[PDB]
Amino acid sequence: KVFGRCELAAAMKRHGLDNYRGYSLGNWVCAAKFESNFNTQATNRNTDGSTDYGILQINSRWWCNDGRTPGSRNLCNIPCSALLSSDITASVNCAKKIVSDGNGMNAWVAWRNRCKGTDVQAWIRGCRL
């Protein structure tokens, strides 16, 4: 599924991401924009042989199991395919563990490079939340 901007904001808010670990909803919408362009089915292979999955491009080495990744830990205890669902619940649950891991949203390199420090509130501007 390809979410609309305000549609994704509302879904992320309903699943308790607004201000989770102190990150406003615009931070999460901005991260999803640059990780996946709001497409739940986005996948990207990394040079280390891992793959990133879903709206927040969660990786198969630490977080989800895809059956083909060396050094796999599956810390979210989920098949990576669950992160491609139209239902963002698995992505949100796994993102909450990632952002709790010590480095906050710096875990998402696109968030650090394209969202951090910017006027992230613009990503929820106009939305009925």
GROMACS .gro file of C-alpha atoms in nm:
model
  129
    1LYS     CA    1   0.000   0.000   0.000
    2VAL     CA    2   0.112   0.358  -0.083
    3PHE     CA    3  -0.013   0.584   0.199
    4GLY     CA    4  -0.104   0.947   0.160
    5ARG     CA    5   0.099   1.185   0.384
    6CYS     CA    6  -0.190   1.274   0.622
    7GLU     CA    7  -0.324   0.914   0.601
    8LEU     CA    8   0.012   0.782   0.728
    9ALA     CA    9   0.030   1.052   0.998
   10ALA     CA   10  -0.314   0.942   1.126
   11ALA     CA   11  -0.215   0.570   1.120
   12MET     CA   12   0.115   0.642   1.300
   13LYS     CA   13  -0.071   0.853   1.565
   14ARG     CA   14  -0.335   0.580   1.618
   15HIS     CA   15  -0.046   0.322   1.676
   16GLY     CA   16   0.116   0.557   1.938
   17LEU     CA   17   0.422   0.690   1.744
   18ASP     CA   18   0.346   1.069   1.806
   19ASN     CA   19   0.615   1.172   2.056
   20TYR     CA   20   0.732   0.811   2.110
   21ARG     CA   21   1.080   0.841   2.278
   22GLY     CA   22   1.033   1.219   2.231
   23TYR     CA   23   1.007   1.211   1.847
   24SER     CA   24   0.713   1.423   1.720
   25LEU     CA   25   0.486   1.274   1.451
   26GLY     CA   26   0.654   1.491   1.176
   27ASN     CA   27   0.983   1.310   1.248
   28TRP     CA   28   0.822   0.969   1.182
   29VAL     CA   29   0.634   1.094   0.869
   30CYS     CA   30   0.959   1.254   0.733
   31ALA     CA   31   1.156   0.929   0.799
   32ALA     CA   32   0.889   0.719   0.616
   33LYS     CA   33   0.888   0.965   0.323
   34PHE     CA   34   1.263   0.930   0.261
   35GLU     CA   35   1.292   0.561   0.361
   36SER     CA   36   1.001   0.426   0.146
   37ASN     CA   37   0.808   0.717  -0.018
   38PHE     CA   38   0.518   0.589   0.203
   39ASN     CA   39   0.511   0.251   0.019
   40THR     CA   40   0.462  -0.048   0.259
   41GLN     CA   41   0.605  -0.287  -0.009
   42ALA     CA   42   0.945  -0.108  -0.046
   43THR     CA   43   1.249  -0.344  -0.022
   44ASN     CA   44   1.621  -0.256  -0.064
   45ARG     CA   45   1.919  -0.495  -0.062
   46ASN     CA   46   2.234  -0.380   0.128
   47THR     CA   47   2.597  -0.465   0.035
   48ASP     CA   48   2.630  -0.677   0.358
   49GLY     CA   49   2.358  -0.909   0.213
   50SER     CA   50   2.086  -0.782   0.450
   51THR     CA   51   1.761  -0.629   0.315
   52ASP     CA   52   1.550  -0.337   0.440
   53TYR     CA   53   1.170  -0.380   0.448
   54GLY     CA   54   0.858  -0.162   0.457
   55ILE     CA   55   0.762   0.200   0.529
   56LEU     CA   56   1.058   0.245   0.771
   57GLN     CA   57   1.306   0.018   0.584
   58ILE     CA   58   1.376  -0.215   0.881
   59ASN     CA   59   1.681  -0.437   0.832
   60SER     CA   60   1.704  -0.818   0.826
   61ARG     CA   61   2.039  -0.848   1.015
   62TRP     CA   62   1.926  -0.716   1.355
   63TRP     CA   63   1.548  -0.680   1.347
   64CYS     CA   64   1.339  -0.920   1.128
   65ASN     CA   65   1.394  -1.267   0.983
   66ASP     CA   66   1.409  -1.310   0.599
   67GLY     CA   67   1.586  -1.650   0.598
   68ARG     CA   68   1.881  -1.529   0.382
   69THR     CA   69   2.080  -1.286   0.608
   70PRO     CA   70   2.414  -1.369   0.778
   71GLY     CA   71   2.433  -1.285   1.148
   72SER     CA   72   2.049  -1.268   1.175
   73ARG     CA   73   1.921  -1.181   1.530
   74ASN     CA   74   1.544  -1.121   1.462
   75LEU     CA   75   1.522  -0.891   1.772
   76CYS     CA   76   1.163  -0.787   1.670
   77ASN     CA   77   1.066  -1.160   1.649
   78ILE     CA   78   0.885  -1.108   1.313
   79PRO     CA   79   0.916  -1.229   0.954
   80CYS     CA   80   1.041  -0.934   0.739
   81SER     CA   81   0.737  -1.000   0.511
   82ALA     CA   82   0.513  -0.878   0.799
   83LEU     CA   83   0.677  -0.535   0.749
   84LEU     CA   84   0.536  -0.511   0.392
   85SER     CA   85   0.167  -0.536   0.504
   86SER     CA   86  -0.098  -0.267   0.432
   87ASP     CA   87  -0.141  -0.284   0.817
   88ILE     CA   88   0.156  -0.089   0.966
   89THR     CA   89   0.123  -0.252   1.316
   90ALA     CA   90   0.435  -0.478   1.277
   91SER     CA   91   0.645  -0.189   1.135
   92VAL     CA   92   0.538   0.042   1.422
   93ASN     CA   93   0.604  -0.223   1.696
   94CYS     CA   94   0.953  -0.296   1.549
   95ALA     CA   95   1.030   0.081   1.504
   96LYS     CA   96   0.947   0.136   1.874
   97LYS     CA   97   1.215  -0.125   1.968
   98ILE     CA   98   1.469   0.025   1.721
   99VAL     CA   99   1.428   0.387   1.843
  100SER     CA  100   1.465   0.259   2.203
  101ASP     CA  101   1.803   0.088   2.126
  102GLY     CA  102   2.029   0.383   2.229
  103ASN     CA  103   2.080   0.611   1.921
  104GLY     CA  104   1.717   0.727   1.891
  105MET     CA  105   1.611   0.801   1.531
  106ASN     CA  106   1.982   0.817   1.415
  107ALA     CA  107   1.927   0.441   1.355
  108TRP     CA  108   1.753   0.561   1.033
  109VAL     CA  109   2.038   0.708   0.824
  110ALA     CA  110   1.782   0.891   0.591
  111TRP     CA  111   1.624   1.048   0.905
  112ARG     CA  112   1.968   1.177   1.020
  113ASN     CA  113   2.059   1.304   0.671
  114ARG     CA  114   1.724   1.448   0.550
  115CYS     CA  115   1.490   1.505   0.853
  116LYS     CA  116   1.703   1.575   1.164
  117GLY     CA  117   1.722   1.947   1.244
  118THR     CA  118   1.466   2.040   0.972
  119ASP     CA  119   1.112   2.180   1.005
  120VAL     CA  120   0.961   1.828   1.039
  121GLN     CA  121   0.623   1.973   1.155
  122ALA     CA  122   0.569   2.062   0.784
  123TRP     CA  123   0.507   1.685   0.725
  124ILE     CA  124   0.181   1.694   0.932
  125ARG     CA  125   0.078   2.053   0.833
  126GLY     CA  126  -0.279   2.056   0.698
  127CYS     CA  127  -0.363   1.709   0.842
  128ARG     CA  128  -0.675   1.651   1.058
  129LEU     CA  129  -0.507   1.493   1.367
   0.00000   0.00000   0.00000
